[PDB]
Unconditional design. Structure first.
Ligand code: EQN
Ligand code: EQN
Lengths: 26, 233, 233, 26
């Protein structure tokens, strides 16, 4: 839904992935 | 010729998103290792955090599979949500150490049967540990684990797919690659026996979907946002 | 040798499961337009017909070579674990695409809504999708019997006293199906693995079937028939 | 189990079968 979309339609970077990981874990 | 290189792409995709039991520094904990509880909160917290991160790793793996990103966003989400538990359960079962009867997570956390139960597996524990033992005579490597992961994920029989025939056009090369790979390694009928292991997995992960609902009652707060997102009706 | 095994399994399936050609259809019109939680009436016939087909599944299993040489404990264990698989595969083999209906062995022909109200509930769309996924396989009696025999004689079932002997019996069945597919449809290249992938779908649905049984008990007016109650859990 | 058992140890006979079917039905 909201986080899986951003993980898929993602321009790669360690900074963006670090943010999505934080949202994924809560 | 495509078949020979598809194997290496899926093997490389798996190796980058799932460190093998080879390159992991094991560590253990002592709490809740003797008595079975309904849920150890400290083990559940680590287990759910580690699960969320391996889910992210599965998305990363899916994006390296040839053709997966050519599917619609809706179909990619649908396939990932439907195969998420399967790939998670398959991954942790390939990190099973038979002599210790343990399983090792990606950060090195190594749990025994009772701890796997207390972390959240509950009544699934013996089903998961039995499957990890049934994998042993197959002698799986990273190419085979990635190929069965890809095959379980790129499945055009999933519900609510927009272009199921396209999904299935992507899975047939993956099935041929595994069939050729097991003929090149070397039991003499390995290919159908590996496909049957997918039937076990899928059966286990359907029971896992039920365990998720029971878990929501027993856990303190709420499920992490990504897990709740992946596992919802 | 393998031709006699194919002939034995095909004969066993034909003797315990009549083809749609021989059955005279009949249709009910109640509970056919609106979805309800449970139509008591349809459930009464549905439970009666399933009890009778469970009995047919045991007759069918007893005709499979080697099955009666297993211990009675293992035969019971295999039959309980494959009961819902074979029932669902059987009814999905009797699916009429033009009508979107399924016909039971007595000729009862239900549409999608009636299947839901009879007891399927949230499994309805899963079962009808699987029945459509079987259509391109062009399955006959031999392939349906071989698929049932493979789901039943599965060495990876829990509580098996001799899993090894069960695996020894399943291997001739898988190669019988592979040989049969090669001779029947030489055009379809990868028909054998796709058939095995259908077992994965079937085992997923019937795992969700064992879940629906729990909620069915609190909705039916009374209690489950004795044989169904023994087979499930 | 109970019914299941007899179905497997069936000196088989339409009479035996009819009895087990009624027991299976209830
Ligand atoms: C269905 C159930 C009990 C409830 C919901 C969640 C918590 C999603 C879950 C997760 C797994 C699982 O396998 N998690 C993994 C966690 C970490 C790694 C790694 O580090 O490689 C691998 C797997 C199994 C069952 C369940
Ligand atoms: C799990 C659920 C919903 C609840 C428990 C029961 C009622 C056992 C059931 C039975 C089936 C089934 O497939 N029954 C069949 C009945 C008759 C024929 C035939 O005449 O050929 C074929 C199949 C599916 C789902 C379920």
């Amino acid at each position: 839904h909201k986080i899986l979309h951003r993980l898929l339609q993602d321009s790669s970077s360690p900074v963006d992935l670090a943010k999505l990981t934080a949202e994924a874990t809560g | 010729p495509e078949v020979g290189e598809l194997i290496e792409k899926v093997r490389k995709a798996h190796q980058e998103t799932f460190p093998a039991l080879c390159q992991l520094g094991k560590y253990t904990t002592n709490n809740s290792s003797e008595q079975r509880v309904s849920l150890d909160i400290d083990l559940w917290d680590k287990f759910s955090e580690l699960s969320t991160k391996c889910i992210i790793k599965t998305v990363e793996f899916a994006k390296q599979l040839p053709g997966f990103t050519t599917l619609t966003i809706a179909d990619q989400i649908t396939l990932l949500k439907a195969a998420c538990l399967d790939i998670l359960i398959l991954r942790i079962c390939t990190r099973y150490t038979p002599e210790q009867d343990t399983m090792t997570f990606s950060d090195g956390l190594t749990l025994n049967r009772t701890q796997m139960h207390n972390a959240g597996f509950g009544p699934l524990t013996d089903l998961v540990f039995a499957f990890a033992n049934q994998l042993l005579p197959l002698e799986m490597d990273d190419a085979e684990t990635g190929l069965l992961s890809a095959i379980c994920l790129i499945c055009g029989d999933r519900q609510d797919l927009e272009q199921p025939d396209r999904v299935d056009m992507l899975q047939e090369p993956l099935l041929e690659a595994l069939k050729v790979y097991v003929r090149k390694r070397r039991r003499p009928h390995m290919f159908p026996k590996m496909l049957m292991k997918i039937t076990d997995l899928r059966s286990i992960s359907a029971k896992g979907a039920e365990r998720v609902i029971t878990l929501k009652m027993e856990i303190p707060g709420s499920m992490p946002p990504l897990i709740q997102e992946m596992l919802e009706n």
